[PDB]
Each structure stands twice: as C-alpha cells, then as structure tokens.
Symmetry: C2
Subunit: 304 residues, 2 copies
C-alpha cells in the first residue's frame, strides 16, 4: 500500500489567503522556517499506478502537478485517478471535483447522507452530470467494508465519526450518522492496516480498540491548544470547528497516542495557527520526541 | 488604473491536469520553453491598494499568494480584495468564491441572469449565506455603467456578449442577454479606457466602434486555429466552447486587431493547446511581430 500526502494543511491551507497571524505573517516575511501546505488530502494505491483520491481539495490542481504518478501519460487525455472517496460533504473536501469535470466519469465513494448534500445544498453531482456521464455514486454503507476495482488489494472499512454536516446542509441541525466518517484501509495482500482520521473529536473504547490493530495512525493535528483560535485571535470557535481536539493535553492527542508506540503516528490536517508549523519551535520538538511525525506536502508513507 | 494579471490560462489552465498534448506533455518534460498558467482572472484598482477581482478562478488561492497587494497585512485577518465582478456563471469563473468564504462578506457584481444561476444550479450565494453575511449581490444592469465604493475612480460599462449559460444552468437552452458579458473600464480621473473581453465569439459594428475608444485591448487568445482541439486531438468542439474565434484568420483576431495599432493589444485566456504558449515558436513570433503581447501570470498592465 502506497500512501501519498497531497495536502496536509486545513481549511484555508497554509498560509491562509486572508490570515496575517504569526505563522502566516511570518512565513510570508521569510522570518519563520516553515513550508507552505495545501488543503488536507491523501492518495492511496496498492500498485502505485492506480490511485484512489481521498477527499478532493480545492488545491486539487497544484496537488496533482506535484505528484508524477497522478499523470502516467499513457495516452492523450489520461489521469492517474481511478476513484475518489468522500469522508464528508465539506466545501474543502469536495470542491476539487469541479476541477476534474473535464475528465469524467469518476467513481465517487460516499455515504447516503453525503450524497444527499451533494445533490442539494452543494449539487456537485447534479452540476457535473452534464459532463460525459458525470459522477457514478458508490454508496458507503454504515456497516461493513468496500473495495474499488482499480485497487482490489485495498480493503476499506469506514468507522462512524460523531460529527455534524456543513452549514449549507439541509440537515445541518439534524446530525445523522454517515455525515463525517474516518477510514480504516487494509492491504489484503500483506495484512497492513492504515488508520486515517484527519477529523477527530475525541476517542473512545471502540476507537482505541481498533486503533491498536493498525500499523499506521494518521490522526489529525489541527490545533496545538484547544483554543488556538483564541490565542492567535483569528477565530471564534474552539475545539469543535475545522479539526478539533488539541494535542497539548491532557485528554489530548499527544497523550492518547502514547499507548501506540509500536506503530507510525503522523499528524495531518494542520491548521495555520498550530505552532507545530514552525520548524525550530518548542511545540514542534515535543511532537518529534514523542515519536510523532508532522505530515507535510509531498510526504510518501508506505507499509508493505 | 492598475491592471494585474492573476490568471492567464483557460479552462483547465496550463498545463491541464489530465492533458498530455504537445504543450502539456512538453512542459512537463522540460523539453519546451513555456511558463505554467492559472485560470484566467485579472484584478483592477485605481489606488493600487483597493482591488476589484474580475472572475474568481479555481486557482484563486495561488493567484493571491503571488501578488503582495492582495494581502496588505494592515490587520490580522485582512485581504486586498474589496469586491468581485462576475462576467458569467461558469465554473471556472466563480469557483474561487467558495475559497473566500472565510472572509465574508464580499461585494459580488453580476447580472440578474448570472445571479439566477448562482442561487440555483450552482448555489454559491445560498451556500455562502451561512458565512457571516455571505455575499451581497450588486446587480449589473444590461444598460448603463456602475462604480464600486472601494475604487470611485473606475467606471465600469459592461457590453453584451452573445453567448450561452453553462450546462448546469436552468436556462442553458434559453439564452438570455446578461449571461456572458464583456467589460469596459474607464479611469474617470485620467479618462483611460481598458477593453476587457476574455470571451469573444465574433466582433461586429457596435464592438469595433467602441474598441477604438479604448487605450488597452485585452482580448482572448484561446486557440490559434478555429479547431485547435481537432489537431491536438483532445477536444471535440471547435470555435465555440471555452473561448472561441482563433487568431490565425481570416476573420480572426490577429486580423481584426490590425485596425487597432494606436493601442496596447494583449492576448489573455490562452488554452493549453494554443501554440503561442511555446516561447520559441513560429505562431508566437507572428503575434509579437503583429504587435500583440501574450499575457502571462504576474503581468502588470497600467494606463494612467
Ligand atoms: Zn494564519
Ligand atoms: Zn494540453
């Protein structure tokens, strides 16, 4: 199984178009060691030639250009994508599709709740249907596992992730399971298991239980402190909107990860406010020492 | 008046995500002198501090980063944009807005027909309304001129451009005037007049007439030959879909521009297939000799 990190930032990526905070005002000022990041998004494959896109970010164009396998040039008008999985119906996880319209049809994998939002509040499916077949919806049942034709060696098993639909959803006040869910990918050939959850509110008994059975833990590292938005003074919300659950602890990520030493633990979906975006920073050190790698654009994780 | 070229490509920009043609397969192969281009889009201003965005492309993020004035950093959470103008409701001219949601409200200028599409087929307005005020629609009457508060020295006078609404429009088969229109910007302080039309099917008597009264002609240079899609073998349509009217002539652009020597003539909205994308190319020479500059990302045109 080949895991490619196309995007590693969050929300407005990094630096954010309209944010002049420490990390952003800093990065632009050349007075801060850090690397720009596009909206979180990873690709998956078993043969390294056929890839399944996980969440289509608004930085889809640049992200594809930066990865050669996304363009095998095995023929004029050809792509390295064979299917896309949607973990929710957020704008920053589905806007990319609009940019893939010139290459339809695409096999989109998403629950019924998400497919509902994508045919109503944000009619990506309706819109694109006017583009050579459009998108072929593939339901992601709330129970069980699925497998895509392009990569028959990858076994997907999505787990429920207590969350709420985007503000444009016809049921934003009526949270149904299937709105936002994590992913458990297993390489049926070797047995390897990747635990992907760029969106985590708080772990429980059922989560941790299945986490230990994973070789690689790709959890979200949005904010260092539950109220990063408060210190930086750029946001109102806290530990709830756009990747929650800080890492500082207690009850934090860095803490819960401690019970997972025999496995690769990486932090993806980093917000522009997170201090772990500063190479030579104190909070960065704590993450490295704890044995947790901070995801970055271009990163290539593999299990085999 | 300060004219900034944020995007100069067309449709899938350049190189196109899924296109392996001569210019694209070439550019990636380092065996072709050319520069990457983002989706067509230009910015305008009279004071160089307040800018009015013309069409919000899907490459809005990268485009803003590449232009310092788009981020005056005069305060945390601040942008250099004060208003956006929409010349139509196409996906590649309005998707950018979704990425500007974290900084609402925005003043969006567009006709009633476009505003209709943006509240139905592609509900950008509905969707964004859930983001601090959202977007404040400013009607662009089919007759007359308008002026935005941020730049009181710029006078906009849009002219009708016989075209059709996008395939997701509830009236895609019922073409109404106001669907797609060009723009005539005048610097009321100096008198200067910029003629912007990244989408031109064919000029007439009323067009040419008003064109001579413009100091700068920023016309579209999508395809060199009416059937670029045919030679390259990547598209079906011809001289009608995504910037039409070749430049080779006769009846072409390079031809009609001849009657406009006393003024700056630039070609923007270039398609990936256009051979004028090859620095050292024969078709490129013909354009330069004819006195027509080929727009590029980062280009800064000024009249004063
Ligand atoms: Zn920031
Ligand atoms: Zn091409």
């Amino acid at each position: 199984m080949y895991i490619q990190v196309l995007g590693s930032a969050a929300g407005g990526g990094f630096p954010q178009w309209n944010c002049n905070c420490v990390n952003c005002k800093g990065y632009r000022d050349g007075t801060l060691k850090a690397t720009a990041r596009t909206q979180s998004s990873i690709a998956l494959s078993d043969d390294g030639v056929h890839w399944i896109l996980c969440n289509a970010s608004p930085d889809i164009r640049a992200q594809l250009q930066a990865f050669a396998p996304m363009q095998p040039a095995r023929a004029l008008r050809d792509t390295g994508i064979n299917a896309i999985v949607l973990l929710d119906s957020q704008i920053d996880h589905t806007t990319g599709l609009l940019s893939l319209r010139e290459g339809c049809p695409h096999q989109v994998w998403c629950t019924d709740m998400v497919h509902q939002d994508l045919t109503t509040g944000f009619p990506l499916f309706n819109m694109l249907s006017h583009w050579n077949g459009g998108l072929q919806w593939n339901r992601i049942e709330l129970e069980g596992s699925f497998v895509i034709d392009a990569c028959p060696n990858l076994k997907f098993t999505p787990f429920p992730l207590r969350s709420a639909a985007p503000p444009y959803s016809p049921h934003r006040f009526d949270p149904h399971p299937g709105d936002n869910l994590g992913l458990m990918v297993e390489d049926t050939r070797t047995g390897g298991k990747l635990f992907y959850a760029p969106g985590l509110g708080q772990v429980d008994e059922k989560l941790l239980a299945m986490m230990h059975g994973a070789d690689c833990l790709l959890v979200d590292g949005t904010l260092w402190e539950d109220d990063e938005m408060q210190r930086r003074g750029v946001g109102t919300r806290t530990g709830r909107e756009m990747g929650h659950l800080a890492q500082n602890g207690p009850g934090g990520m860095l803490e819960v990860l401690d019970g997972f030493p025999r496995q690769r633990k990486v932090l993806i979906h980093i917000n522009n406010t997170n201090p772990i975006l500063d190479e030579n920073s104190p909070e960065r050190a704590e993450v490295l020492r704890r044995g947790v790698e901070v995801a970055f654009d271009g990163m290539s994780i593999e299990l085999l």
